[PDB]
């Protein structure tokens, strides 16, 4: 067929009940994730093609970058809680991988301050149990699929995107193939 299990996607042998409809994982340490988000704009182009009533969830992971990797999962929880993902995603990626100016939790915080989140607001969120809960939700979702690599995207707890089964000669074509595959999977 045009879409084939093992080609554009794979099928989880242990399906996850109650999983987010479309679930993306990344790390700000992850070089391919930098490409996915900053250059390919995968999340945006996937979202722009999702059926009505299909929501997209994006979570950070701990298994890259040690201590700072865990700090970034907590900062991503702050970003989600405050709803400022679209303000901090670029400077966090660039801070970690382009300028390499993010070396500590304080450096992460500076990115939010520069993006206009007030210091008191950031610190209250950082220390909040709402954010602890969001951190737990990120960890649980990744654990549910035994996640050991990023970038990764899952659909309905059942299917995992397989971008290695896609032509990478043209960036634009690759992105819409990925997006069309997520749409196809969500409609299964
Ligand atoms: O996910 C995959 C599979 C193979 C490579 N990658 C990562 C990547 C990074 C940056 C650009 C491309 C790309 C896609 C079409 S033209 C250039 C692909």
Curated annotation (Swiss-Prot):
Gene Ontology MF terms: protein disulfide isomerase activity; protein-disulfide reductase activity
InterPro entries reported in the protein's UniProt record? DSBA-like_thioredoxin_dom, DsbA/DsbL, Thiol_disulfide_DsbA, Thioredoxin-like_sf, Thioredoxin_CS, Thioredoxin_domain
Entry's PROSITE patterns? THIOREDOXIN_1 (PS00194), THIOREDOXIN_2 (PS51352)
Q: List the disulfide bonds.
A: 30-33
Q: Which family does it belong to?
A: Belongs to the thioredoxin family. DsbA subfamily.
Identification of the protein by name: Thiol:disulfide interchange protein DsbA
Which is one Pfam family of this protein? Answer: DSBA
Q: Which domain of life is it from?
A: Bacteria
What is the predominant subcellular site recorded for this chain? periplasm
Per UniProt, subcellular location reads as: Periplasm
Transport in keyword set:
no
């Amino acid at each position: 067929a045009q879409y084939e299990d093992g080609k554009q996607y794979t099928t989880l042998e242990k399906p996850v009940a109650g999983a987010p409809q479309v679930l993306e994982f990344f790390s700000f340490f992850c070089p391919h994730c930098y490409q996915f988000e900053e250059v390919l704009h995968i999340s945006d182009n996937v979202k722009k093609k999702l059926p009505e009533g299909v929501k997209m969830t994006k979570y950070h992971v701990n298994f890259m970058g040690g201590d700072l990797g865990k700090d970034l999962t907590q900062a991503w929880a702050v970003a989600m809680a405050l709803g400022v993902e679209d303000k901090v995603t670029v400077p966090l990626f660039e801070g970690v991988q382009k300028t390499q100016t993010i070396r500590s939790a304080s450096d992460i915080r500076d990115v939010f301050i520069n993006a206009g989140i007030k210091g008191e607001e950031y610190d209250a969120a950082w220390n909040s149990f709402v954010v602890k809960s969001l951190v737990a939700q990120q960890e649980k979702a990744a654990a549910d699929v035994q996640l050991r690599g990023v970038p990764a995207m899952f659909v309905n707890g059942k299917y995992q995107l397989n971008p290695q089964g896609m032509d990478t000669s043209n960036m634009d074509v690759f992105v819409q193939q990925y997006a069309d595959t997520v749409k196809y999977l969500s409609e299964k």
